[PDB]
Amino acid sequence: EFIFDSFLNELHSDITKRGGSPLPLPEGLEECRSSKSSSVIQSWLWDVPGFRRWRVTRLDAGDSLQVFNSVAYPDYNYDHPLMGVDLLWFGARQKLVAVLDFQPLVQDKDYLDRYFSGLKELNQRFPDLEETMRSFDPNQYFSSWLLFCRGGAEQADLSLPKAFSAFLKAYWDLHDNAKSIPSTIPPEEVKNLQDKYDIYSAERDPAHGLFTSHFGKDWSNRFLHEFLFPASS
Numbered sequence: 428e429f430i431f432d433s434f435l436n437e438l439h440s441d442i443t444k445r446g447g448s449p450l451p452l453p454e455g456l457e458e459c460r461s462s463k464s465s466s467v468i469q470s471w472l473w474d475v476p477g478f479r480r481w482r483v484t485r486l487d488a489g490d491s492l493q494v495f496n497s498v499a500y501p502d503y504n505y506d507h508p509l510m511g512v513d514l515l516w517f518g519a520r521q522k523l524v525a526v527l528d529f530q531p532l533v534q535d536k537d538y539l540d541r542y543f544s545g546l547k548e549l550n551q552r553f554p555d556l557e558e559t560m561r562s563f564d565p566n567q568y569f570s571s572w573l574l575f576c577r578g579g580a581e582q583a584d585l586s587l588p589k590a591f592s593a594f595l596k597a598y599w600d601l602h603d604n605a606k607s608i609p610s611t612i613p614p615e616e617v618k619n620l621q622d623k624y625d626i627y628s629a630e631r632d633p634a635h636g637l638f639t640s641h642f643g644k645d646w647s648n649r650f651l652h653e654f655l656f657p658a659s660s
């Protein structure tokens with residue numbers, strides 16, 4: 428809970444330091460409170476220089492659930508990976524699900540070579556963070572060097588905090604190193620590929636059940652298709 432808050436504030440502080448400013452969300456999607464769960468989900472959009480979209484979501488459902496999630500979409504003139512962060516803590520089962528990746532637009536060797544030196548290094552530094560995916564395809568819109576942990580309190584408390592900060596710093600470094608460097612994928616196709624990221628991710632959505640339980644079918648669907656993965660229908 429406090430750990431997840433610190434991630435949100437670091438990200439928001441970083442965004443602010445970098446000249447980012449808040450953007451309005453579709454009405455009703457910025458906050459939803461569970462009529463049953465005592466669960467609260469809050470979301471943000473940012474105008475971050477170099478990025479055409481940047482969303483953040485924080486779900487506070489006490490000891491039942493904590494979530495911190497964020498996706499960064501670079502401006503179309505950058506073909507570099509998206510940032511994807513999906514962190515869940517299930518208090519009843521003392522269960523951590525932590526996924527952090529630089530989600531690649533393509534799997535081409537040259538593209539992976541170009542962008543992944545930092546993530547490769549992070550992956551080596553935080554080995555406690557082997558897991559198999561049951562919904563997503565590890566070869567579509569994920570890299571080989573993602574941090575993917577299904578674990579417990581030790582991982583959540585001891586490794587995740589420093590790993591998140593390192594991951595975030597490595598993502599900014601990635602973006603900054605891409606400034607003024609030729610993109611190999613041009614803007615029209617970066618757009619197609621980012622939109623197809625939304626389409627893919629909405630198709631494989633592992634969260635609809637959790638969302639529906641807390642917030643109802645209608646809100647969950649709006650949230651998925653209007654905020655999470657806006658190019659999806």
Ligand SMILES: C=CC1=C(C)/C(=C/c2[nH]c(/C=C3N=C(/C=C4\NC(=O)C(C)=C4C=C)C(C)=C\3CCC(=O)O)c(CCC(=O)O)c2C)NC1=O
Nearest residue numbers: 484494496511512513524526528560561562563633634637
């Ligand atoms: C507020 C938004 C949001 C929430 C709360 C969320 C929840 C959510 N994400 C999950 C899995 C997952 N989530 C990810 C990864 C990601 N998923 C992403 O949305 C992004 C950007 C990444 C980036 C790395 C992966 C790899 C899994 C495992 C699913 C699988 O087994 O295929 C799961 C299943 C837990 C499990 O695998 O045991 C839940 C309930 N997903 C969301 O999008």
